[PDB]
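We recall that each integer encodes one residue's backbone shape. We quote one record:
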Amino acid sequence: ETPVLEKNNVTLTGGGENVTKELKDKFTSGDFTVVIKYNQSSEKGLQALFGISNSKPGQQNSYVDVFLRDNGELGMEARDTSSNKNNLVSRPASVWGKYKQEAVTNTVAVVADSVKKTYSLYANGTKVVEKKVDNFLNIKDIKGIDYYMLGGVKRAGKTAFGFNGTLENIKFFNSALDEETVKKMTTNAVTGHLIYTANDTTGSNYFRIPVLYTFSNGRVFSSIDARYGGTHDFLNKINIATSYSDDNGKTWTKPKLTLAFDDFAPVPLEWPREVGGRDLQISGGATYIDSVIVEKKNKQVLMFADVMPAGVSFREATRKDSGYKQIDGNYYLKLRKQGDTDYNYTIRENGTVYDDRTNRPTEFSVDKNFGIKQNGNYLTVEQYSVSFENNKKTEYRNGTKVHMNIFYKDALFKVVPTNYIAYISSNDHGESWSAPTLLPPIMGLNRNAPYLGPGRGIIESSTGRILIPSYTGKESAFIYSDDNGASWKVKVVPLPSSWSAEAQFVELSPGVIQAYMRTNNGKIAYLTSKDAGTTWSAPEYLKFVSNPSYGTQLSIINYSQLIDGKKAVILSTPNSTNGRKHGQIWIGLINDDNTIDWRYHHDVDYSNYGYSYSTLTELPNHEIGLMFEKFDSWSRNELHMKNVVPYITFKIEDLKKNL
């Protein structure tokens, strides 16, 4: 309940402060909790917030500490020289470094619990890790502890891991405080930058692929992947969740599930992060993934997403079948009934399922949310849950009956196991949505649908054409409507190599459009159209971004206000050959000849901090909103982490840097 020691406002420059006299032998049980509110003046090197050690020659592997790395990783050590027990518990991407040129105040904590044999670490309101270890050490288990310090570890008479910064408040407790208390204690201004959080109203512990859009009524809208079984692209269960703000991004609605299947329950799952287990996946729930948003000229809002039947992955999907038949000039989604070899059925007018062999209606039908009926009554299946008690994953039928659905593995009639694109519409700026509409097979009957480029669509100003970015793995696929979204066509552009070409558009001048996109060669590519997306140039490449060959998604938007007398675009991307890190926001000024002068940039946090997928929007007051993956979402070391997708705002003056 009350600390054995509390200190305030201790500024350090790598030297530490001895507090041995104020801690000596105060950890009676040997358990501990230490809560540290701090900021770093420099991020370089491994830095300890505190160190409790045997400082004598030869005992340099007898200490407890909590530490920070230059990549945002928070960890702790607990080591005993004589028994050769060496415990290290941590999670990447746990803290923030700097924000708009200034040191961020974080609050972190460590709890050591002898009865549970666990070490737990907390950062800004989140329990980032709790790990049971066989070789558990408490302070009494480490022999001859004799030195207690702030801002380093005393090892063989010298200070190691010197902290550079201010310890604004540090509290030491001689017991293991409970989780709700410590979450509360660590909650601060950083916590308020999370819109989506682990086990909120989505039920997901994990999130990826954020998207931001500002509507013409001033509402700021966000969408994201709620990924339940860790952060895996596949196999997984994924829903699209949404949340909005009516006050310029200051406060946000409780998240809602907007696109969601219910073959698997949306539940918080503890996905393992060890080298064995982290590769584990569920068997696969039907999935929506990778959202794109656009507002039409009439103020209707459209959201697109990829749709995946349960158990099917992007890599295994058949690329030789659209999942449609053409019968009497119309495109009908086709179905295979359990036990049949061929696809003998189609969904036709009113959702009536026809037997294509006899060309007559069956007693079965499919509603607009893909649920299956027989004689006007719904068929049901049992929903699955996943549990992880210790180390063993189990999937089981959970007692809930849900509507049978053509995307589920337990359905009597099933779609082709490939990918599809769906869209929904809203007439109330995101408060409610229509039932989904599957795109027709615009790639051809014998090709799979494209994969969407997460972010936004645009309306080209001179023609009114709606453009939706997508890709196939070998080509760009620019999806478009010329009839205000009643029907859809595609422009397919072959690419120099097999890019995962996630793309976004900007308009330079009336009729002139650029598509900026991810590649497999380390650069960001851009293609240019001078006829509103009908024809496209060969790729050009940005000169100042150099990334790994796998690449990352980007965000680029038009900005409404003049910067230095010029129309501007704003770009967000990682920029680093060592991983998804060194996030930058760039400002491009459109020249008279429609080339771009990339004149300014701002680094988002320090350069070794993680930065993956991102999304930009212009707020109603002309500030900029950014939401991004503040971690490396490619790296096998940073999978399955909670509360790592923050929202932040910038004034143009915050971005106009590095001339």
The two ends are 52 Å apart (CA to CA). The CA atoms of residues 44 and 459 lie 45 Å apart. The chain has three domains: 1-191, 192-319+418-659, 320-417.
